[PDB]
Amino acid sequence: EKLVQPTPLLLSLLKSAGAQKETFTMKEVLYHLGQYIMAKQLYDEKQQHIVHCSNDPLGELFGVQEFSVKEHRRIYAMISRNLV
Numbered sequence: 307e308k309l310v311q312p313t314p315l316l317l318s319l320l321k322s323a324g325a326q327k328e329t330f331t332m333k334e335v336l337y338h339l340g341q342y343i344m345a346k347q348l349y350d351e352k353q354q355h356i357v358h359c360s361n362d363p364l365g366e367l368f369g370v371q372e373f374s375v376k377e378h379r380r381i382y383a384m385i386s387r388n389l390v
């Protein structure tokens with residue numbers, strides 16, 4: 307319900323994944339990031355909850371080389387450091 311403003315670099319990732327605006331609900335951000343993950347096939351083939359991103363823009367924005375899609379509190383925290 308409350309809205310968030312992604313910083314410019316996060317925003318650019320979201321638009322590369324189909325976002326067509328600049329303010330979002332957390333849910334919409336998570337959705338486009340999920341699609342971005344799928345589109346770049348950042349997930350591990352065998353351990354599919356794991357995202358490899360040391361060589362991806364997301365890795366630098368999130369400050370991690372790997373993380374799990376199931377780590378929701380951690381994912382919120384990584385996203386929050388990229389919201390205005």
Ligand SMILES: CC(C)(C)C[C@@H]1N[C@@H](C(=O)NCC[C@H](O)CO)[C@H](c2cccc(Cl)c2)[C@@]1(C#N)c1ccc(Cl)cc1
Pocket residue numbers: 336337339340341343344355374375376377378379381382
């Ligand atoms: C599966 C897919 C497409 C990557 C989407 C994920 N799929 C959501 C997820 O938890 N998948 C694992 C479910 C597990 O197998 C138990 O059933 C994940 C998500 C959903 C809601 C809140 C958060 Cl914080 C994260 C996911 C979404 N949507 C996601 C979005 C962005 C990021 Cl950065 C990481 C995970």
